[PDB]
Design a protein around this ligand. Sequence first.
Ligand SMILES: NC(=O)c1ccc[n+]([C@@H]2O[C@H](COP(=O)([O-])OP(=O)(O)OC[C@H]3O[C@@H](n4cnc5c(N)ncnc54)[C@H](O)[C@@H]3O)[C@@H](O)[C@H]2O)c1
Lengths: 496, 502, 496, 496
Amino acid sequence: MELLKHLSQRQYIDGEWVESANKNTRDIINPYNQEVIFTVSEGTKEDAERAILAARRAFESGEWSQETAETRGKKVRAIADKIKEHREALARLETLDTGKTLEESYADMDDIHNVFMYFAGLADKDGGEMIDSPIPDTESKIVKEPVGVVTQITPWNYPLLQASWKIAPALATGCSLVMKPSEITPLTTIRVFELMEEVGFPKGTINLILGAGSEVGDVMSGHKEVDLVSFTGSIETGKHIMKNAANNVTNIALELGGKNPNIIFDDADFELAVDQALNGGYFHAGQVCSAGSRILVQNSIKDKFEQALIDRVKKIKLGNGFDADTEMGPVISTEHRNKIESYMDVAKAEGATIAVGGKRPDRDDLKDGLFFEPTVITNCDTSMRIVQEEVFGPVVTVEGFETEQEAIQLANDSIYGLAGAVFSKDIGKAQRVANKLKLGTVWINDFHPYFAQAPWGGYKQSGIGRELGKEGLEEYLVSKHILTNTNPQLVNWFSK
Amino acid sequence: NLYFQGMELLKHLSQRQYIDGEWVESANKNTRDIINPYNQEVIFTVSEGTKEDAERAILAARRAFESGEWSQETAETRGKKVRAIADKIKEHREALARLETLDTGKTLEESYADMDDIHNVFMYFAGLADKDGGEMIDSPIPDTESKIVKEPVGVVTQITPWNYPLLQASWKIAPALATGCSLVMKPSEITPLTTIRVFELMEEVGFPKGTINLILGAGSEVGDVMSGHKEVDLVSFTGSIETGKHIMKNAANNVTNIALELGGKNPNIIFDDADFELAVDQALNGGYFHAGQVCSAGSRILVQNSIKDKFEQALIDRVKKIKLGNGFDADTEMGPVISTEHRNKIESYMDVAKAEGATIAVGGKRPDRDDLKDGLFFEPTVITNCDTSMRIVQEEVFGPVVTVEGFETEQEAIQLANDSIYGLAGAVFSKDIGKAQRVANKLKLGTVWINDFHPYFAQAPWGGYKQSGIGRELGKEGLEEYLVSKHILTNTNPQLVNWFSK
Amino acid sequence: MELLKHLSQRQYIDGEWVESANKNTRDIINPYNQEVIFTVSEGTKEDAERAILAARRAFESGEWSQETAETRGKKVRAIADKIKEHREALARLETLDTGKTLEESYADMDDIHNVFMYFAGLADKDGGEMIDSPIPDTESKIVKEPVGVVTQITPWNYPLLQASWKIAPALATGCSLVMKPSEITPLTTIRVFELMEEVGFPKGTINLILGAGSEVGDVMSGHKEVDLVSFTGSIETGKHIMKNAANNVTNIALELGGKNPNIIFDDADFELAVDQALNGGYFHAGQVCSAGSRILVQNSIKDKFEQALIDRVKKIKLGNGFDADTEMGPVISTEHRNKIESYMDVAKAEGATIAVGGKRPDRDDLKDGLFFEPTVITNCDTSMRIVQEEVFGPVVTVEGFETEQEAIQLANDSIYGLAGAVFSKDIGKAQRVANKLKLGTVWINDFHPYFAQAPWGGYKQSGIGRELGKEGLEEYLVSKHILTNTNPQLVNWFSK
Amino acid sequence: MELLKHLSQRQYIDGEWVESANKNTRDIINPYNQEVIFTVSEGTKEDAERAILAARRAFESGEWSQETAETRGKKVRAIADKIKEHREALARLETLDTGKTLEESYADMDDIHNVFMYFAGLADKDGGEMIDSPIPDTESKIVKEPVGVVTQITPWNYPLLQASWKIAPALATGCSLVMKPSEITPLTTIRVFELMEEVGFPKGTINLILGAGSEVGDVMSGHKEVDLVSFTGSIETGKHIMKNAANNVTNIALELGGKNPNIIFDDADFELAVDQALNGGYFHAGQVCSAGSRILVQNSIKDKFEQALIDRVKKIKLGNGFDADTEMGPVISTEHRNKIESYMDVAKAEGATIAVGGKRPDRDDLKDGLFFEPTVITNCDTSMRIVQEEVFGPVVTVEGFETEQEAIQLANDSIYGLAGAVFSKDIGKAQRVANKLKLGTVWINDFHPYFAQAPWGGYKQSGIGRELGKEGLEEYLVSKHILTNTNPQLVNWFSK
Ligand SMILES: NC(=O)c1ccc[n+]([C@@H]2O[C@H](COP(=O)([O-])OP(=O)(O)OC[C@H]3O[C@@H](n4cnc5c(N)ncnc54)[C@H](O)[C@@H]3O)[C@@H](O)[C@H]2O)c1
């Protein structure tokens, strides 16, 4: 609440904080109590176009695109320092907006700092290659250039984190960007723009559009001047975006959902598996793309595991993200909670069992909030929708498997392939499994970790491209082969 | 004679599709007649596959990929197989070149050069197969091991054009096999000859059942299965912009990656301080090799005003002497265009140009000469008095046609050259190399040639900026379209987090 | 014997097969029976100089150094094909010259083929980099060039194998080379030069000097025109070479000996450990740089292990390398056998036990040959010379250890660091150990494997630089930074 | 000024500032006036050993070597920030100690900052590779580890700059180091150690020895526990160091002298060439390893060029490095000035001409200082010592050439190959030349620039290895190939 007293309420376009073209606004809600906490501009599609054209003009002027990579790196480092300096405030702002615990928000800010720092350090390390030309008397080189104008669209679950993954490499490479956060959670994204403005970037290099994807999204994906669309969100929106981007053969980087398996063998450290099954399923109320919603447990320990998990789920402390006792916060919106509730009806209807949870909590201090009980669904199989689809709530399904081959089959039996885990003390076995899983990230005896040093993204329908790591940077670069003939000779193919 | 020998080849050439290790007919036994553009005679009849055939191939590729017979084979061994394919190309170099000239109509010498490139393309990728399996990352988390493993992407569909059939096919096949993917290829319905032949050769080398598949058919009938089937992990397409957009939209249904190699409106920038005769020679080469039916064609000539009049005159005079004829005759400098339909598009573009106010300085019609009457020939053409706002300048005609525009300054040449939706390739001619470098840096093109025109090679990536494409072919980047990264993170000292209560 | 009827007996200098400058010769001996089997030229130091000057002239002419990398790659591939084509004959020639089994020689030829093929494929893959310059209006690039003239010196144990590791990358990069094999084993090296000549290389690009290192070695290491000395041999010779190479600040790549540990935990697959302890200690009669001469076995199974090993050592079949029943051949020379024998006296004198072997075999069919029984030395410790020094014979020492830390400490307690192994079914433990071992190569549950795809070399005193892999190629390249100022301006630091 | 009042006077060993073991000291002299300005400890060989053993102990404890690369990077960044924070004081300290102008010292500090920043950013970017193993059922990976204990020896010309090139990558990779600056110029090196201590590194990770290479140098190059010797200095000292390092097969990185050509064609921008010839020859009174001491000018403009250069040399303002008017300071020592003077006698005796300078300046305010006039030597040829040898003073030679081929031949006609330049408006020609020059760095239309992003080092006798760039980091890393057999099988080569 104090934090918002000086926070900007507007969009940032072509170096100026401006309102929506039609002065329209939107109320931002705190999911803990559903109170309106802040009011921001609700931009129009013309605002998005104007931002894009400004990014284009700025890119062509070359003030940022022709700046030395070393200097661009120092600026990105400066942004990183700002994140660390305002770490406390940013974490509170994110907990206020998304509802997750304050400790989870602090960890985000540490990651974000590191994300910017990583890309700041990578900026001046690889400018292309020299090729040994197969043509005598020619020089061949590949220069890597910033792709140009980039649109960046993020989700509401980890707003600033997902924003950092896009902004950092865009600025490091010299691109101009136009970013639009989830309409429902713009707070930390607004704040980071204020911070980037303080660091100082050329007019038009960075732009912030605030609005609903349904209104402004198509301009951002289908405008002719966009060279790349980087999107993190749901599969249906990503498909739509890709179809639209095709109108101008615009490259896309998509970071979509997952149906991430958490494979638990009987030779796994049992208490560790239970601990990590809870972590995997319920951090941020399961509103995490890396969530371990699909638990695969070996039959010999399935019954014992289900019991232990259920018993633990019954003790999970729900509450306000600002209270240190809180272990799980509310879900993001009314709409989202409704989808979760409909999924419970779907599960019962297909023949599955709600072993625990599956409803709103009764407790007094939670009535006003968008809470939903941590849930465990049993007696289910791969043919069911509750197992195949991304619920994105505090819900997990438990399936049994007999053999190592069967666990692999089940784990890969989904349209997705973002991330997953394998728990077993037999490391050789965990490696065999990891190798056969069609997942962008595989954890052996762990669950959730990602970091700037390594690429993150999907196999199959969890995405296209990668974020983080050197590959994350490559989404923002384009190669140019400049071939110079040092002893040009007439070919005389067409008779003189 | 050389014609005769090319035609003899057809009597042993397969007429069918290659699916799941078997040469088979179309599911409905339908067929198609292949035509030689030099005389329009039917020269061969092949199967015309159905969409079900394409699905069956895709499912076979999937089954083969999952069995691991190729995907789990050692990279070194995969490299040897790809090298074996390369050796086949060289061994059958003569026959393949004649087959390509017969099918596409381009000169035999141009076809020989293709076969040399193709050999080298396979050889390059054969050598690259076992060189980079991923990375070891220094993890920021103590007591963890972090590594990135690069795996073959899976099932890949490959679609090619009629201009340089085997060349474009090699750019896709080589890295696919080198990385361990399974593939389903469909060449242009109009030119399947060399693609069929290369499959016979790949079969001789020996690959596991389903690893390679050849579908023969029209993109309008089987294309959507190849781009929109759930089991496809990557669609690699080389063709026109409209088809590519359609493909990308369809591939989106399953969030399927795409690599697109589309057209271009490639500038050939000529400064007054360029070696004049060299610029004229390369303007002709740029515009008329393969009758301008080349994606790297220099259709848009930008010449500095001080030498524009002198240049136009020299170019026109040279265009009047270009020898047209049969690709098999050594005297032939330019062959026919590929089809009736395509020649008609070119003819309509001449009407478009006159209607916008441009001038057909020379050519712009079918040649009269007797020995060319039966063929799909079209005269090499030069269009003058035109500007960037015109369709004849902005759009890819893909025929033996070039436009000439003047420019005063270096900045103006860059602006005109970048004033198109495309960005595949281009050239700069000037003896002032520093200037050519400044220009090259500002051109939004995947490939820029300084004092040259046309060269590409396996060692370096080829592809577009802007609407000329997505992704790259050739070079290490060409191989990366066929790989997918996996981050395997191992916690070597796992500890409970105890976030959730007791 | 028939193989030698057409084999050249001369040196190859500046495109010509020539005799020694003083017509001196040397008799080559078959260690199986000590019979003279061939006579070759014994070159003079002036021959070595002439070769070096020819390599220099050839390098400067640019016929090979300026040839396209792609074409160079095809030539190296052609050499590879020759190896495969003459595989049978080469293997027999190596068994005749070195005395190792024919099967071991066949495996060498397969490796060699692959070594050339690997480097043939690597030739045109990396010509340098484009750097993002921190100075505005400048272009910065790094071009990688062949280093120039290279001298290559090899040992008698695996003559052609060690030669291939040097020749392949030298030719692939465009260098000129002068090679000198061990004076006692020149057969396969001569043959490969005949084969390289058939392929065709420009005059002076390749040169073969035949002679004793004590006579011609110093020219090869200390001549001003040499840019790199690549040496594979013993530590003392390497030190001498490095000292001499210093006279002209000449780069060196050294591949020296080792005291390679073979660590066996009690949770190792017991029979596998015994099998690999034998393999590690007795392939090629222990005359291998990767030999597992130092066995470290966990105390709990030490007694059982020693007994099993000893019993197996007593059944090792000695004989002629050409007989299929032969499991271990003779040692290379009288001199070398004598060193091994004196090491037995050294061991007894320090208080160690010759548990088995330690002498020449009695059997009739072995009397004439340079045989020495496979040996096991027990009751020894790290302070002993028999444990610290490279015997390079069919001999192994057995030391016990209690803990994982103690095994690491003992394994690292030597001046060397070439290779080693860890045997345990607990893979996590084997990884912890592997990470702490100061060895260029570590095998987990295996012993001996190397391959072109990966670099091989030492930590500590086992060497300087690497052979094989991309790093192997880098020993033959030198970087040049070409910086172009595209907008040169006077600095005017000094008064006008 | 007051800068020295708080500056430490001692060595830094094993986390403690300590005196020499024998309490011996040394007086530091300001070359501007030859006054003693500071007194520091003069360490013994035992001190150097103790530092080395402390570095070893620290490396094995793993407090720094096992720290995450990301964290190591942050520390190196912290050092970089210290340099920028104390830039003023450091620059004055370097001008006081070395005598060069204050502006030159400020530029150094900017470079140094950037050197540390670059390596800070490179620290966590490449930990090794995954190899596609040719052996089925095996995993192959290459891990890059810090090499271990490193000794670093620097010259007196650019003390802190040369130190930064070694310290930055050493710390970034996780090595322990023992540094010894030139005995005559320890001021900035002492200061940077105080700064590194403030940042905080584990006990023994960094050590500073102060001495005389003739007394402590051999311990630093020949001690068994050293894994790498990084040396920047003269060729004779480097050779000595290499020979000594050989005793323990210790890797060496040598950055030695040069006889750098400055090639000037008749189609060069004339005034630019004259300006850069002066810069190349007289910055820091020619006491720079990248000095353009050997001018090669095309005959058609040779006479005109010599006249213009001479006229400009006559106006060079000599004086105190602290005075803004000063363009060139004094030379470092009496001994060094004497060497320069004897080289003038050598030049006259071989038949060359001292066209201008070649003596001490007469002006009053320079009488007390170690000044020497900027000099130009004409009518000389490649056979002369004045042309072949590194004088390392404010001296340049001028040679004529007719053709492009002749310029290349003359430029490469020396034992060295560190750096050089080509001046011509015909860029294509400058590229042809640059390609043929055997130099680690080639400047086209510029002279002197180096930067962290690109490797610097020599061809031929100018050195071994590289500093700066990724290659600079690689001198501090060693590769380990860990091969795991995932399906181990008995080989059964030996009888059961
Ligand atoms: N590190 C590895 O990759 C590797 C591989 C195989 C063998 N090796 C080692 O090599 C050794 C093989 O034994 P060796 O007896 O052949 O070694 P050696 O040092 O006695 O002989 C090696 C080579 O050096 C030559 N030589 C002798 N004096 C020389 C001199 N003064 N200057 C230059 N060259 C001179 C010899 O003629 C011979 O060609 C063993 O120590 C073994 O461990 C190492």
